[PDB]
Amino acid sequence: KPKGALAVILVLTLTILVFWLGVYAVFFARG
Amino acid sequence: DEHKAHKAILAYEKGWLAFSLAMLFVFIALIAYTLATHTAGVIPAGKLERVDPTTVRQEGPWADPAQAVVQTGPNQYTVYVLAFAFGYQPNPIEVPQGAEIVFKITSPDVIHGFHVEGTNINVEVLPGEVSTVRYTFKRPGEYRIICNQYCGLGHQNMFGTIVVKE
Amino acid sequence: SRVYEAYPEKKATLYFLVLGFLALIVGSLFGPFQALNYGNVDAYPLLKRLLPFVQSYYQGLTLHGVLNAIVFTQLFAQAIMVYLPARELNMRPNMGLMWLSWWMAFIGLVVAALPLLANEATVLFTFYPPLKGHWAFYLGASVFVLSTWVSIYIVLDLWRRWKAANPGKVTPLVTYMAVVFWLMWFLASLGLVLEAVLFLLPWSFGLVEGVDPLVARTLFWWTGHPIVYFWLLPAYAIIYTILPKQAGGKLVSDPMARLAFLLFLLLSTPVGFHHQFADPGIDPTWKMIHSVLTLFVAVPSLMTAFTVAASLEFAGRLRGGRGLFGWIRALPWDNPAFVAPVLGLLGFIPGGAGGIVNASFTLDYVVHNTAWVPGHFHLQVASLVTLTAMGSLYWLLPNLTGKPISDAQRRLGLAVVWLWFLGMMIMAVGLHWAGLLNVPRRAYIAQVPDAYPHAAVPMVFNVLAGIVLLVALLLFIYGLFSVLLSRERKPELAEAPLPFAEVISGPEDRRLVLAMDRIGFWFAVAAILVVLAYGPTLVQLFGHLNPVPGWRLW
Numbered sequence: 001k002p003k004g005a006l007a008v009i010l011v012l013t014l015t016i017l018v019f020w021l022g023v024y025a026v027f028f029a030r031g
Numbered sequence: 032d033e034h035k036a037h038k039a040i041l042a043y044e045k046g047w048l049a050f051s052l053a054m055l056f057v058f059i060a061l062i063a064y065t066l067a068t069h070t071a072g073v074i075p076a077g078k079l080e081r082v083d084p085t086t087v088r089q090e091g092p093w094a095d096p097a098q099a100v101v102q103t104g105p106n107q108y109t110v111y112v113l114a115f116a117f118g119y120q121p122n123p124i125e126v127p128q129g130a131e132i133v134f135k136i137t138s139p140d141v142i143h144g145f146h147v148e149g150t151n152i153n154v155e156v157l158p159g160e161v162s163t164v165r166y167t168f169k170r171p172g173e174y175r176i177i178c179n180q181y182c183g184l185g186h187q188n189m190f191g192t193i194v195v196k197e
Numbered sequence: 198s199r200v201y202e203a204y205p206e207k208k209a210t211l212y213f214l215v216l217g218f219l220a221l222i223v224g225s226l227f228g229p230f231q232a233l234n235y236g237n238v239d240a241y242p243l244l245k246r247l248l249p250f251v252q253s254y255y256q257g258l259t260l261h262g263v264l265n266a267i268v269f270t271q272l273f274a275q276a277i278m279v280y281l282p283a284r285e286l287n288m289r290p291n292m293g294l295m296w297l298s299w300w301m302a303f304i305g306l307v308v309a310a311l312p313l314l315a316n317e318a319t320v321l322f323t324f325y326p327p328l329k330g331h332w333a334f335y336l337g338a339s340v341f342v343l344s345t346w347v348s349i350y351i352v353l354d355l356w357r358r359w360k361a362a363n364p365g366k367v368t369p370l371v372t373y374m375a376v377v378f379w380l381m382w383f384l385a386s387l388g389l390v391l392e393a394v395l396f397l398l399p400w401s402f403g404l405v406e407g408v409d410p411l412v413a414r415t416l417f418w419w420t421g422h423p424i425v426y427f428w429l430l431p432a433y434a435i436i437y438t439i440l441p442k443q444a445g446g447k448l449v450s451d452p453m454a455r456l457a458f459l460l461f462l463l464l465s466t467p468v469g470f471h472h473q474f475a476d477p478g479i480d481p482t483w484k485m486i487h488s489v490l491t492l493f494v495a496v497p498s499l500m501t502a503f504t505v506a507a508s509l510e511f512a513g514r515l516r517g518g519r520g521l522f523g524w525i526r527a528l529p530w531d532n533p534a535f536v537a538p539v540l541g542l543l544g545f546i547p548g549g550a551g552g553i554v555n556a557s558f559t560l561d562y563v564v565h566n567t568a569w570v571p572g573h574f575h576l577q578v579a580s581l582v583t584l585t586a587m588g589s590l591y592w593l594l595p596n597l598t599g600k601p602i603s604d605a606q607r608r609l610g611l612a613v614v615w616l617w618f619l620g621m622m623i624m625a626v627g628l629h630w631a632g633l634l635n636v637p638r639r640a641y642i643a644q645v646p647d648a649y650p651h652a653a654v655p656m657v658f659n660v661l662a663g664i665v666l667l668v669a670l671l672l673f674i675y676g677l678f679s680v681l682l683s684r685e686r687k688p689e690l691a692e693a694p695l696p697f698a699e700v701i702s703g704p705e706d707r708r709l710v711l712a713m714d715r716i717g718f719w720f721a722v723a724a725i726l727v728v729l730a731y732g733p734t735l736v737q738l739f740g741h742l743n744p745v746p747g748w749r750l751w
């Protein structure tokens with residue numbers, strides 16, 4: 001398996017999830 | 032080795048591509064949901080509603096700011112806001128808490144922002160058009176309006192005020 | 198030079214590169230001051246001593262945006278996406294036409310610059326009506342951009358000339374990239390051309406009293422989004438077809454790369470309402486559609502991320518790296534041309550994460566028109582694209598000029614790249630963070646020093662990033678001219694082959710590649726997708742035009 005390639009996309013998923021879930025929380029706090 | 036590395040690389044890339052698509056799909060489901068809540072009120076009405084910027088301070092509902100706030104439902108207020116260089120009329124905007132506020136905002140000069148700080152109200156105000164948006168204030172007090180579309184040299188200091196009464 | 202006689206395309210490209218970077222440097226002068234502004238620190242007095250023609254924050258913001266985001270990026274795309282395919286094919290691009298395109302650009306830039314430097318066009322690089330600039334700004338912008346139509350003709354010409362000599366061969370990688378690239382650009386360009394010709398130019402010449410703000414904004418963002426993919430794909434051509442070699446490895450999938458690009462040809466243009474989420478007179482159903490279409494166009498990069506990371510890993514393994522981490526340290530970190538793109542990819546992770554946030558219909562109300570947005574796009578274009586173009590100096594300059602890079606010049610290169618990366622990282626934090634605190638973009642906020650008290654913390658990031666980037670920019674200037682105006686000239690450099698990567702073995706999807714090469718057919722699909730996505734809305738807008746008087750408020 002491409003272990004490193006996957007680590008990269010782990011970080012990328014986590015970054016995306018944190019961003020998106022983050023702003024979702026904010027959107028609703030302001031709703 | 033290379034033949035193998037390639038096979039494994041391509042197998043797993045397909046894993047990734049399916050999961051990512053999935054996650055994108057879920058976000059779409061989650062956006063959809065917001066569309067079904069009352070929080071979607073801040074999306075503009077996409078109806079065209081054209082006015083004449085050159086006469087809007089002389090005639091119509093933007094002409095007399097002390098009458099900008101009309102009760103249009105048993106728990107509903109429409110508020111006619113002028114965004115202009117460089118400010119908002121009326122100042123303040125006075126609405127009651129708990130009530131659904133339909134904002135109908137326009138401009139006589141150039142484009143402005145109407146960004147109500149602390150809320151999801153964020154709408155571009157284009158001269159010639161009326162922007163319509165809906166919010167219910169849950170908490171009483173003072174919200175700042177921020178202009179967030181560059182509108183000339185007075186941009187950085189163009190602010191307004193919404194007072195939400197108890 | 199005999200070399201230029203045999204390869205006159207080296208000289209045209211060199212010209213596109215230098216002008217681009219000049220535009221970059223001049224544009225970028227304004228950045229540190231802007232960074233200090235978003236840190237609540239007013240250094241504009243200082244600037245107006247150095248540059249007395251500068252009348253305001255917003256004139257500088259116009260120059261900054263026009264020069265970095267429009268001029269340098271386009272000059273760069275024209276450089277890379279002509280010369281690369283031309284070298285891959287070993288064919289001569291039409292030299293008459295190539296020079297027509299450079300002078301078009303240069304002429305147009307100079308005409309547009311006159312009113313910009315004279316404070317007659319302080320509209321932003323978005324120039325939304327009814328804010329009304331000098332006719333020369335619109336004319337010269339129009340002629341600058343149209344230069345790309347010539348480019349489009351050139352690479353299509355190369356393409357077909359090749360196919361003729363080579364019937365029943367598939368299109369080679371870089372050239373398939375460049376071709377879908379340029380065809381994508383042609384559809385996308387139509388929006389702005391439309392806007393300039395139907396509206397901006399009549400108006401500004403005085404032929405018609407008003408312009409409809411909504412219709413102009415709609416036509417602007419037709420072009421307005423895929424212009425960023427126009428910016429991006431030149432970098433991606435290098436990241437895919439060159440970087441793998443620089444890193445010590447190979448490109449791990451020709452077809453995966455072709456697919457990324459093809460997806461960009463299809464999905465780059467029908468998405469622009471993601472800039473008009475807060476606009477009136479656009480139906481919410483159409484905003485949802487474009488929102489969904491926007492989440493799709495994020496796929497080619499989600500894809501790119503894996504393909505490229507895997508290529509990087511393969512390189513690091515080739516070069517002895519053991520472990521889950523060791524393939525990273527095994528890479529050529531002393532090579533500026535490797536570091537620059539890779540750092541840019543790193544920042545691209547939070548960049549695209551913010552793009553994805555922006556594209557969600559209702560989530561955009563949280564961040565629209567706040568410092569968040571500049572936060573997103575400095576990761577995307579001021580970092581990944583600029584860093585890529587930067588590190589190509591160390592391979593592509595020698596190739597075009599015969600001018601060697603000293604070991605000393607290489608070390609300065611690393612310093613700039615890193616300092617640019619890091620500075621951009623630090624600024625991205627101050628901006629996103631300030632954005633979440635409701636600080637507006639496009640605002641001289643140091644002039645209202647008590648307006649945003651809750652933003653004290655991120656502000657210190659913006660200040661820091663300001664001084665850090667000032668140093669990086671100074672160093673970039675010194676270095677560029679240190680190499681450009683250098684003494685030595687070894688011609689066996691200009692004759693060296695571009696460092697194109699090999700593709701890894703082995704077997705592949707020949708039918709996929711073959712389907713993807715049906716380019717005429719994909720071109721039309723893409724164009725249908727635009728008519729479908731923009732048609733009905735635009736027919737209503739045009740059927741109910743409400744023009745307004747223009748204003749000068751500076």
Ligand code: HAS
Pocket residue numbers: 008012323425426428429471472491492494495498499501502503505506509525539542543545546548549550551552553555556557561564565566570573574577578582
């Ligand atoms: C180059 C320039 C540009 C790119 C690229 C870009 C990408 C995106 N953008 Fe954006 N953006 C928006 C949507 C997105 C989304 C969905 C993406 C996506 O394409 C992102 C996809 C990318 C990913 C999902 C990440 C993949 C990661 C990669 C590829 C890196 C992996 C790293 C590796 C492999 C390295 C590892 C190596 C080792 C050493 C370990 C929206 C809304 O939907 C708005 C309007 C918001 C508003 O309110 O105005 C917007 C506005 C902007 C503006 C300002 C417009 C203005 O001035 O008014 C600019 C100029 C800009 C630039 C650019 N934009 N964008």
Ligand code: HEM
Pocket residue numbers: 225227228229231232235258259261262265266270321322323571575578579580583637638639640641662663666667670
């Ligand atoms: C020394 C590096 C640079 C610094 C410190 C810097 C800083 C800034 C900051 C603070 C702003 C926000 C100002 C505001 O919202 O009012 C900005 C806007 C901008 N930047 Fe840069 N910048 C840099 C280089 C670049 C580069 C390389 C690009 C293009 C490739 C770029 C593209 C833009 C554009 C498009 C704008 C938005 C203009 C507008 O909204 O009208 N920046 N930059």
Ligand SMILES: CCCCCCCC/C=C/CCCCCCCC(=O)OC[C@H](O)CO
Pocket residue numbers: 238616664665668
């Ligand atoms: C390689 C280049 C990277 C650049 C990294 C450079 C280090 C940043 C600052 C270090 C000293 C700390 C400075 C703090 C001292 C004075 C700050 C102050 O009090 O501000 C003055 C005034 O408010 C303003 O108008």
Ligand SMILES: CCCCCCCC/C=C\CCCCCCCC(=O)OC[C@H](O)CO
Pocket residue numbers: 018019020021022023025026029544547622623625626629630633
């Ligand atoms: C290397 C450079 C990278 C730059 C990185 C950019 C920084 C932004 C990161 C995450 C934002 C996540 C959203 C933040 C959510 C915080 C608040 C929250 O969780 O929301 C509930 C709150 O009650 C509402 O008022």
Ligand SMILES: CCCCCCCC/C=C\CCCCCCCC(=O)OC[C@H](O)CO
Pocket residue numbers: 010013014042043045046047050
């Ligand atoms: C909220 C959800 C929690 C988020 C937490 C992070 C999730 C990680 C995401 C993607 C990993 C993608 C890689 C999936 C691997 C697919 C398996 C595969 O295709 O492997 C075939 C191979 O041949 C076998 O031998």
Ligand SMILES: CCCCCCCC/C=C\CCCCCCCC(=O)OC[C@H](O)CO
Pocket residue numbers: 028057060061064068
């Ligand atoms: C392999 C596994 C297959 C199954 C995968 C399923 C993924 C489910 C993820 C998210 C569901 C979204 C739930 C939608 C509910 C949203 C409501 C919400 O968040 O409401 C907050 C707010 O206060 C209200 O007004």
Ligand SMILES: CCCCCCCC/C=C\CCCCCCCC(=O)OC[C@H](O)CO
Pocket residue numbers: 026029030148149150170171172173174175626629630633634
């Ligand atoms: C690395 C990145 C770190 C980033 C860290 C993120 C910090 C921002 C968090 C939340 C903002 C959410 C906005 C919530 C707004 C509430 C304000 C409010 O409700 O007050 C106004 C009202 O008028 C009172 O009367």
Ligand SMILES: CCCCCCCC/C=C\CCCCCCCC(=O)OC[C@H](O)CO
Pocket residue numbers: 525526527530531543619622623626
């Ligand atoms: C708040 C944000 C400011 C801080 C920004 C931090 C963001 C990420 C920074 C660096 C990435 C480094 C990635 C790995 C770098 C590799 C260098 C390496 O491994 O060095 C090998 C060495 O040269 C022997 O050959």
Ligand SMILES: CCCCCCCC/C=C\CCCCCCCC(=O)OC[C@H](O)CO
Pocket residue numbers: 011015018019543544546547
């Ligand atoms: C590979 C390149 C590097 C990519 C890696 C960078 C990704 C950044 C992700 C998250 C940072 C956000 C910081 C955490 C958010 C803080 C939330 C918070 O405390 O917000 C206030 C809230 O209201 C409670 O008080």
Ligand SMILES: CCCCCCCC/C=C\CCCCCCCC(=O)OC[C@H](O)CO
Pocket residue numbers: 236238653657660661
């Ligand atoms: C030598 C290489 C490493 C050194 C790099 C420095 C480390 C980063 C830490 C702080 C940056 C400080 C810069 C900010 C100083 C400006 C002062 C300022 O604006 O302070 C705001 C304060 O809140 C007024 O109320």
Ligand code: CUA
Pocket residue numbers: 115116117142143144178179180181182183185186187189
């Ligand atoms: Cu009104 Cu900015």
Ligand SMILES: [O-][O-]
Pocket residue numbers: 421422425552
């Ligand atoms: O532009 O996203």
Ligand SMILES: [Cu+2]
Pocket residue numbers: 421422423425469471472
């Ligand atoms: Cu876009």
